[PDB]
Design a protein around this ligand. Structure first.
Ligand code: ADP
Length: 108
């Protein structure tokens, strides 16, 4: 075998909900939110980590952007949880511009 696979680093962490930037509105099915609440209470390991873009700014500041995972995010909030399991996906400002376009911040 001549080759390896390489990609961005992703690691699951229990991230404080408060650190997550959520620039976009959520599209929520209220019954699906409640279903997740029930599942988180009874069987949390069956609820996957949400994906979060981990971006480092020009001066090394860390920013955690959350797009999607709307139902899980809402369900953790309704449970008043401090943290949520999240896959932190190392990403760039170019990756961020895909979601934020002209409003993409010059992050520091
Ligand atoms: N009761 C549940 N209702 C919906 N999704 C669930 C439930 N329990 C576990 N899951 C898992 O959680 C993830 C939720 O994904 P999704 O339905 O796209 O909601 P969101 O991405 O908006 O949080 C899925 O991978 C699904 O398999």
């Amino acid at each position: 075998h001549m080759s390896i696979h390489s990609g961005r680093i992703a690691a699951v962490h229990n991230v404080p909900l408060s650190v997550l930037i959520r620039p976009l509105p959520s599209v929520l099915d209220p019954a699906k939110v409640q279903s997740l609440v029930d599942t988180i209470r009874e069987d949390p390991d069956s609820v996957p980590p949400i994906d979060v873009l981990w971006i480092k700014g020009a001066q090394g500041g860390d920013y955690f952007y959350s797009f999607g995972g709307c139902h899980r995010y809402a369900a953790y909030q309704q449970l008043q949880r401090e943290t949520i399991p999240a896959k932190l996906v190392q990403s760039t400002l170019s990756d961020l511009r895909v979601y934020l376009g002209a409003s993409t911040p010059d992050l520091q």
